[PDB]
């Protein structure tokens, strides 16, 4: 139908070509769409090789026969995204067909240590007879992390919930971990800790009832 590579890498400042191949491209002027996590698609190329006003000149397109291509010259960090090609089929009433998508990884971006903020349960939640510790983790790269919790200096695994990392707008990653307690557990302890392990190093934050 309309096939493209699901995963393609390119180093910063270098050039990458993303190809789309299918019989519906013959005689057709393809269009291309960029999508970042948590956002709607954005048209980057239409009519084979035309750019909308807001799109940087390093984006360009071409096609011959059954194959179309999107080229990013000197790729920047903000080009990291999913790219979809688009055509209408030559049969029937010509329905719209999307390629399966290409995820563009841009290599050579700076690593980063996680930024960890730990909130105690709020006075309002405790008075609602619940208690949640909120450990917010941001600005780490690459996006692989593990989180452990401590009660005083003892491990606690009951009541832990932890998201998978998600890509931030600066291409770094974010995650969160919640510790559920009872109000009597929170107010009687000495402290609670969130330990965030990332690329061999660990950041631990501690809060106490006061």
């Amino acid at each position: 139908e309309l096939t493209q590579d699901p995963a393609v890498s390119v180093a910063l400042g270098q050039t990458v070509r993303i190809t789309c191949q299918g019989d519906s491209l013959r005689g057709y002027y393809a269009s291309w769409y960029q999508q970042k996590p948590g956002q709607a698609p954005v048209l980057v190329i239409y009519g084979k090789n035309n750019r909308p006003s807001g799109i940087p000149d390093r984006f360009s397109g071409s096609s011959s026969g059954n194959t179309a291509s999107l080229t990013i010259t000197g790729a920047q960090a903000e080009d990291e995204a999913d790219y979809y090609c688009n055509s209408r089929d030559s049969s029937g009433n010509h329905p719209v067909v999307f390629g399966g998508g290409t995820k563009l990884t841009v290599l050579g971006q700076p690593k980063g240590a996680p930024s960890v903020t730990l909130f105690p349960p709020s006075s309002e939640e405790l008075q609602a007879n619940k208690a949640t510790l909120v450990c917010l983790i941001s600005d780490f790269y690459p996006g692989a992390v593990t989180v452990a919790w401590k009660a005083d200096s003892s491990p606690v695994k009951a009541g832990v919930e932890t998201t998978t990392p998600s890509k931030q707008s600066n291409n770094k990653y974010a995650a969160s971990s919640y510790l559920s307690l009872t109000p009597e557990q929170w107010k009687s302890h000495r402290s609670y800790s969130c330990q965030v392990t990332h690329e061999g190093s660990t950041v631990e934050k501690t809060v106490a009832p006061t």
Partner: protein, 231 residues
């Protein structure tokens, strides 16, 4: 300068009918444009649903043709989508979009009327589930000395126990966007979601400026404006 905004029900029961609206602003539906629908199942690619012209003509994806109806309303300046007999496969983000007049067939005298979608809505999340909808409990994440690091401080809002997705959060009714970070939700063991939203601010502004998080959970028609104050 067309802008598009989706509006739909959030949750739809199995075998029920999905109903969505797209409000058109900065432009008129009574113009040469193909008002269109596209969807995106969680973690997957994009799928064209159909398009409509203001006179009434439509074209649909042949795999949805038997279940989809697209309609236009010139007086309200909006178009709409109905998807019947919904199942779990129909859980997705639904975008409305705009395509200029096009001519892609080989019988076209002109070949420069390319087909593309230049204007997109923000999307609306539809979930197909027999479970019931539940609105969120919102709690403040107050700033203090143990959330201040130098000239920077963190404060936020906890949004607990809601279903289905999504919840969107803004700050001061949109008058604060620098430093705002809404984290992706966690799917708890109970089947409910929770997320947090945090804003980093200069620590000299603590107590001298008002911070209010605006939590919206459209699937349960619930909004909560929560005042966040220092400990």
């Amino acid at each position: 300068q067309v802008q598009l905004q989706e509006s739909g029900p959030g949750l739809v029961k199995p075998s029920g009918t999905l109903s969505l609206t797209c409000a058109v602003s900065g432009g008129s539906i009574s113009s040469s444009n193909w008002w269109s629908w596209v969807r995106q199942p969680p973690g997957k690619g994009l799928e064209w649903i159909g398009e409509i012209y203001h006179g009434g003509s439509t074209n649909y994806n042949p795999s949805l043709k038997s279940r989809v109806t697209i309609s236009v309303d010139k007086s309200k300046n909006q178009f709409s989508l109905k998807l019947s007999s919904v199942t779990a496969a129909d859980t997705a983000v639904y975008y409305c979009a705009r395509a200029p007049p096009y001519c892609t067939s080989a019988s076209c005298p002109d070949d420069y009327y390319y087909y593309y979608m230049d204007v997109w809505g923000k999307g609306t999340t539809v979930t197909v589930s027999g479970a019931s909808t539940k609105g969120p409990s919102v709690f403040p994440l107050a700033p203090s000395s143990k959330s201040t690091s130098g000239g920077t401080a963190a404060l936020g809002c906890l949004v607990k126990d809601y279903f289905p997705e999504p919840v969107t959060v803004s700050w001061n009714s949109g008058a604060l966007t620098s430093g705002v970070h809404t984290f992706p939700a966690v799917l708890q063991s109970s089947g409910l979601y929770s997320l947090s939203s945090v804003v980093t601010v200069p620590s000299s502004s603590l107590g001298t400026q008002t911070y209010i998080c605006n939590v919206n959970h459209k699937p349960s028609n619930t909004k909560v404006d929560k005042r966040v104050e220092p400990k």
